[PDB]
Structure 1
Amino acid sequence: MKTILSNQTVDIPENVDITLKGRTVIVKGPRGTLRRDFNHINVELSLLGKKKKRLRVDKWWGNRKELATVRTICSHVQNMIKGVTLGFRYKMRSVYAHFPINVVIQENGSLVEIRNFLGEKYIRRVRMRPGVACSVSQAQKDELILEGNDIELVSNSAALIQQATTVKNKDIRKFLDGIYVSEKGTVQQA
């Protein structure tokens, strides 16, 4: 069964504009510019009005599998809007039983070094994705603050940090040490 037409409309706030070059979405907000293309999905994108800036995603004659792509595109567009308007701040808490985790935020927050993870002499060097800034929270003793515009890049850096401190050859249920994402939040809280 091919559904004749499946569409969903995403509203754009007044402080941010979106420009389309075919299926390449250019989103320029106050926090910066995010650009992402969708050439791998054969859908129709159009801007509706000059008043409220409605964006519609259209797919004509789609089977069950490709109909799921419309809302995926809509969610990605909303994530880009949220990033360029409010931004993405991920809070990760480092937990430990005996050995405290020493975290060094190197130049511009692009490099993170972990010293005493489980007391081993190795040093973990994790480089953040470009455009993502990592920092140590000034309000908490063990908290890492990751800030950036693109949700995928920020969460990818967070996943790299989380997987970097991985216990090996031990019962991970008992040995719960490592750095783990506490919450996924925003910047500027607006």
Structure 2
Amino acid sequence: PIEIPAGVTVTVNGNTVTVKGPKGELTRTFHPDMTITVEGNVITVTRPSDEKHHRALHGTTRSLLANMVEGVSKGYEKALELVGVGYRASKQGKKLVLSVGYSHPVEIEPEEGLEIEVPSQTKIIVKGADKQRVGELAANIRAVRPPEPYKGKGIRYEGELVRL
């Protein structure tokens, strides 16, 4: 039960939902094992089960959709924290070049779609087009570089804390 604001070109074929937009050019999938919902100016949930089970099944899609959108129009953003009294980073090459001891930093690449940003060496973050494909990779590096909360330092999901 939602919307499809400005530009959300929507094509639900075979079970795939093709969503074209601004900086959100995206083609996602969406179950045939249920009921689609679209009307050119809105859209929503279809009851191919109405029953608790599948109920949620779409009770998820809903979001799912919600994603396509917000994703297709305003792309997504993951806020990362660079907390290292030694570690540090600042883009380099078509990827990121973080560092945190060891000896060989590392170059990480946001394959077509994903795209990282070095607002300022210390902190960084990613802006993709699919919260999905984002949060993941977004993190898949947030760890990539041990956050070790033994006493404070390392890659950490924005809004963390400490320890003892």
TM normalised by structure 2 equals 0.82
Q: How does 1:74-153 map to 2 (within 5 A)?
A: 74-96=62-84, 98-99=85-86, 101-108=87-94, 111-115=95-99, 117=100, 119-137=101-119, 140=120, 142-153=122-133
The structural deviation recorded for 1:131 is 1.0
CA distance in 1 between partners of 2:37 and 2:78 (Å): 32
Distance 1:162 1:145, change over 3 A: closer
Corresponding residue of 1:30: 22
Deviation track 1:112-171 (CA, whole Å, cap 9, x = no partner) reads 2322x1x3224234332431111210xx5511131121111221121111111115xxxx
Instruction: Choose from 55, 66, 69 the match for 1:67.
Output: 55
CA distance in 1 between partners of 2:65 and 2:26 (Å): 10
The structural deviation recorded for 1:81 is 0.7
Larger Rg belongs to: 1
Q: For residue 103 of structure 1, give the secondary structure of its aligned residue in structure 2.
A: coil
Distance 1:129 1:156, change over 3 A: farther
Q: For residue 71 of structure 1, give the secondary structure of its aligned residue in structure 2.
A: helix
* Runs of 4+ residues over 6 Å off in structure 1: none
The structural deviation recorded for 1:63 is 4.2
Q: Contact conserved, 1:43 with 1:57, CA < 8 A, in 2? A: no
Contiguous gaps of at least 5 residues in structure 2:
160-164
Q: For residue 76 of structure 1, give the secondary structure of its aligned residue in structure 2.
A: helix
Q: Contact conserved, 1:23 with 1:44, CA < 8 A, in 2? A: no
Q: Contact conserved, 2:75 with 2:129, CA < 8 A, in 1? A: yes
Contiguous gaps of at least 5 residues in structure 1:
1-8, 184-190
Corresponding residue of 1:187: none
The structural deviation recorded for 1:57 is 2.4
The structural deviation recorded for 1:95 is 0.6
Instruction: Choose from 137, 145, 160 the match for 1:157.
Output: 137
CA distance in 2 between partners of 1:61 and 1:144 (Å): 43
TM normalised by structure 1 equals 0.72
CA distance in 2 between partners of 1:22 and 1:10 (Å): 22
Distance 1:102 1:177, change over 3 A: same
CA distance in 1 between partners of 2:123 and 2:149 (Å): 22
Instruction: Choose from 30, 35, 38 the match for 1:47.
Output: 38
Aligned residues: 159
CA distance in 1 between partners of 2:54 and 2:102 (Å): 48
